[model samples]
Target: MHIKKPLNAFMLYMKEMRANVVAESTLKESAAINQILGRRWHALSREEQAKYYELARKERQLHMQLYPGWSARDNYGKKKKRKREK
Candidate 1:
């Protein structure tokens, strides 16, 4: 049950961005959703974790397509490229 700090960080970042576009109640709901995902992510088996990694990558790509100027995309690109180089 290894925790994926980078992926979790990206999820949090996206959730925060989503929060900003909605009301206070919606922000609270989004934050709670983030917490649920984060906890489950930490508890995932290695194979499950790999699946989440793929899913998160796809979500991040979709986010970038929807919001091309997001700073998260820049961070994601650097992290993704660094992983590839390893």
Candidate 2:
């Protein structure tokens, strides 16, 4: 049972380069590094981002083949009772 959702363009890019940024900047905390990732993600030109977009498209193609019935409802996680359980 190795089913999972597909990654978006940004997520796919991060999966490949998050570690490289952490190493180049030597940042231990991920939160700060994430901020940097966002900055860099935006700084890159659209032409560059399109490459990731294509990869993400392929990822979705594979995801559908693996789990054709997958839906957003499956990604909703748990439906816990709200309003501060007393």
The RMSD of every model to the true structure, in order and in angstroms, is 11.6, 4.9
Query: Residue 15: error of model 1 in Å?
Result: 11
Clash count, candidate 1 = 0
Once fitted onto the true fold, the runs of candidate 1 whose alpha carbons sit more than 4 angstroms away are 1-43, 72-86
Q: Work out the TM-score per prediction.
A: 0.35, 0.72
- Computed on alpha carbons, the lDDT of every model, listed in order, comes to 0.54, 0.77
Candidate 2, poorest ten consecutive residues by summed lDDT: 72-81
lDDT of 2 by residue, 15-74 (tens): 777889877887858778777778889877888888988999899888888788676455
